[PDB]
Amino acid sequence: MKLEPLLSDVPRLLMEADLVPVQGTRFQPTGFPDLGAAHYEGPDGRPMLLVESAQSMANRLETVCWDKDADDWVVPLRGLPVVKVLDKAGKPLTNSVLEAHRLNSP
RNA sequence: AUUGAAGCAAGCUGUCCCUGAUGGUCGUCAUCUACCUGCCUGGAGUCAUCCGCGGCAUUUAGCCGC
Known about the structure:
This is part of a larger assembly, with one chain. The protein is mainly β. It has one helix at about 55-65; strands at about 40, 45-50, 65, 70-75, 85, 90-95. It has 1 helix and 6 strands, in the order ββαββββ. The protein binds one RNA strand through helix 1. It comes from Thioalkalivibrio sulfidiphilus (strain HL-EbGR7).
């Protein structure tokens, strides 16, 4: 089975997903420290809001693949390279899949 | 302020080349709630013919439809 030939020369991949609140018609947006909800005026005048930052989206999208109790990848992803920290007593302190800076941490 | 030029400190030296961007989770709990009279008395009234004088007439030279 193959799919990469269709993307072997394309310059970029773009994907869009449309959501709805499951019940009711409200949601809680990100509470950024300096201003709370990040509202701004759109190019076409209309009010706009940023739900969350792409850095937080990345912190989530990396986490969905790590099984924190086992300290291992999900079964389909098991065996891929990862570096893991242990404390002086050998307990699993942290791993770079969950670290902030990804190989540049204290 | 003027006939015979203040209309007069007038000619006086500052140019083109440079990439400031890689990555940071602002997130969890909170009961706003209970009692109360709006209402009340007050005159808007009164008389004034839709007919058509249009059209024909530049018209008082003279009449005629719906």
